[PDB]
Design a protein around this ligand. Sequence first.
Ligand SMILES: CCOP(=S)(OCC)Oc1cnc2ccccc2n1
Length: 117
Amino acid sequence: EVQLVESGGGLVQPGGSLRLSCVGSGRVRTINTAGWYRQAPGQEPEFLARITVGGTTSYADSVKGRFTISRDLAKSTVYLQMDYLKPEDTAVYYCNADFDFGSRTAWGQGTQVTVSS
Ligand SMILES: CCOP(=S)(OCC)Oc1cnc2ccccc2n1
């Protein structure tokens, strides 16, 4: 059993920046990969980034050069550094973790990011 808790969203102006946290608890030593997803109003959830235990990162075209995913194994936390923020980045951001040799998956509760004014 792995649980994920998110924090760090909020309201920011276009051009601002935010860091989102994804704190994992439970059998975190079985986690294989972690990823960040977002769900815009009225849209399917969308893959954003992915990171392995070793630190290899993968990104979608929509956030390449603007968002950064990292992980701190000492704290069981995965971060999403959201920079160069556009109004189109307004969404609920979700983190996930694949564990037990990628057989199971856990999701965070989501955190709202609003880019306005
Ligand atoms: C949401 C938290 O994700 P992370 S930092 O994994 C990102 C891939 O979880 C952890 C934490 N400790 C670990 C120790 C050994 C092996 C894997 C671990 N994964």
